Design a protein around this ligand. Structure first.
Ligand code: NA
Length: 426
């Protein structure tokens, strides 16, 4: 009963803890997978469109961006606030035009589409300035569910990486963002930096004709959100420390560096953003001072807490336990979910590292890393990732062993890098 509300209609959350709590004599590491499933106030959606000069080459990119933005505008819920930002070396708000958010209705939608129609390709790319302009818009709606769609076809060449980092840090906690890169001339690492910090994902659009449906689905999912700002609140006893907190499903995102200190050092908050009707899994590892054989400790207490307008609401809670035993039939048991997601994190890293080696012609390193990734993808039944790995590798006819290809299609490599963090469920 520790939290008071300011008023609500939040999703109902089912909270499960998945662990083998039994540890052998010396053991300090406790692992658990937390499954969170949400079942059934204002939305603000900012659509940020790259209008740099390269967007006309080929012209299908700019045309798709316009088509797709119009689909997004039509997919907004009646009453949702929205804006469109044209990104170049600067950022210009192209709708609305009076410096105040307007609700989506027949009139505002039509006016927004007309403004989108007048977008043209010219200039450079400074993504941080796009984020900073979105942030100014979002600051006008502090209690809203706030989400940005960012589309680019290029690298962030008109500002420094420290400039981008400064804009990312200023955006954290203000809005969430999903990013899309169209074509092959942008940098997965750049968009990943933005999307990971802002609790979203990156996607690649290899064919401009698919952008509209992609925008439709991103907007619809955003409109499904029902609660704006949810923290995963983790308590661990004195001397116990958090090794890591990672989202592992549907995507891998390490939250460890995002910890926000709570009221005391024993409690910290890890941001999860907005929730609709959805499910996520997290992998938590706590290092604890080992107890005696026979002794049980609480290694961690996990709460999910919605923060809203000067109040908070406890949405769910679970416990991460630690019991020391000499019964090896209990301690040697492998928690299937922990093992699975440990492998998914390893796989994602192996893909990225393998692709980076391959790009440089460091082929023996690529073969070892992409080989490990393949082994994990096969073992976990991640058939989509197996299929993408087959595009960047080949079976050496002599050894029958898998090797990294010397020459790969740039798009195939980029696509795999982008979806390296998409996991398969347990
Ligand atoms: Na560009």
């Amino acid at each position: 009963n520790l939290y008071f509300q300011s008023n609500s209609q939040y999703p109902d959350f089912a909270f499960e803890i998945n662990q083998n709590e039994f540890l052998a004599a010396g053991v300090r590491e406790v692992h658990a997978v937390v499954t969170l499933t949400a079942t059934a106030s204002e939305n603000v959606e900012v659509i940020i469109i790259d209008c740099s000069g390269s967007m006309d080459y080929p012209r299908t990119k700019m045309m798709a961006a316009k088509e797709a933005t119009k689909v997004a505008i039509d997919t907004l819920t009646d009453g949702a606030f929205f804006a469109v930002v044209a990104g170049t070396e600067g950022a210009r708000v192209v709708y609305p035009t009076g410096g105040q958010l307007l609700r989506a209705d027949y009139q505002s939608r039509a006016a927004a589409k007309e403004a989108v129609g007048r977008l043209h390709a010219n200039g450079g790319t400074a993504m941080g300035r796009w984020l900073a302009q979105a942030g100014r818009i979002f600051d006008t709606a502090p209690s809203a569910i706030k989400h940005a769609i960012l589309l680019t076809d290029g690298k962030d060449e008109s500002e420094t990486p420290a400039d981008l980092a400064r804009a990312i840090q200023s955006s954290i906690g203000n809005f969430t963002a999903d990013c899309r890169g169209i074509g092959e001339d942008w940098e997965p690492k750049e968009l990943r930096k933005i999307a990971d910090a802002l609790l979203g994902t990156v996607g690649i659009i290899r064919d401009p004709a698919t952008l509209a449906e992609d925008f439709r689905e991103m907007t619809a999912k955003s409109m499904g959100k029902e609660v704006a700002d949810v923290a995963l609140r983790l308590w661990a006893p004195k001397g116990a420390t958090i090794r890591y907190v990672k989202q592992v499903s549907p995507n891998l995102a390490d939250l460890s560096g995002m910890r926000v200190p709570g009221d005391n050092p024993l409690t910290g908050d890890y941001p999860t953003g907005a929730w609709g009707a959805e499910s996520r899994e997290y992998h938590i590892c706590v290092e604890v001072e080992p107890g005696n054989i026979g002794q049980e400790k609480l290694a961690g207490r996990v709460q999910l807490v919605a923060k809203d307008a000067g109040g908070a609401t406890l949405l769910g809670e679970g416990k991460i336990r630690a019991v020391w035993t000499e019964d090896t039939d209990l301690s040697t048991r492998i928690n299937g979910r922990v093992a699975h997601y440990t492998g998914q994190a390893e796989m994602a890293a192996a893909i990225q590292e393998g692709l980076d080696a391959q790009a440089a012609g460091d082929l023996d390193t690529a073969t070892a890393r992409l080989g490990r990734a393949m082994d994990l993808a096969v073992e976990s039944g991640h058939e989509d990732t197996v299929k993408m790995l087959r595009k960047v590798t080949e079976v050496d006819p002599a050894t029958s062993k898998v090797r990294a290809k010397a020459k790969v299609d740039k798009g195939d490599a980029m696509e795999l890098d982008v979806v390296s963090t998409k996991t398969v469920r347990a």
